[PDB]
Structure formats: structure tokens, C-alpha cells
Amino acid sequence: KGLRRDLDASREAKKQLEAEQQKLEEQNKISEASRKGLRRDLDASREAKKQVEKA
């Protein structure tokens, strides 16, 4: 159900709701859990085996 994506046009309305949820995620997590700094969890691989281009 819900096939109306032309007459209503919710684009500017969607960019306001999504901006509040995404900002509250970065503030609660503390930049991917940064307790110590350069230890085991922060300096593990390349983003949990993700950005492994050069390594």
C-alpha cells in the first residue's frame, strides 16, 4: 500500500526528520566509542575489516 510519490512530493519534509535522528546517534555513541584513544577496540583493523584498500 501507499503508492503516492509525485502529487504529495515529500523531499524537504524527509530531510528535516532524518537530520535529527542521525545527529542524536553520533552524540550518544561518542564517535564510534572513543574511551581510551589508541588501544585495542579503536585501532583494531580498518573499520572492522571494511576500508582494507592499501592494507
Domain at 1-55: CATH code: 6.10.250.460
The ranges assigned to domains in the chain are 1-55
Rounded Cα distance between 44 and 52, Å, is 12
Task: Map grid coordinates 524527509 to a residue.
Answer: 14
Cα-only R_g, the chain: 19
Question: Do the beta carbons of residue 54 and residue 47 sit within 8 Å?
Answer: no
Task: Map grid coordinates 572513543 to a residue.
Answer: 34
Rounded Cα distance between 35 and 39, Å, is 10
Technique used: NMR
Cα dihedral across residues 18, 23, 25, 32: positive or negative: positive
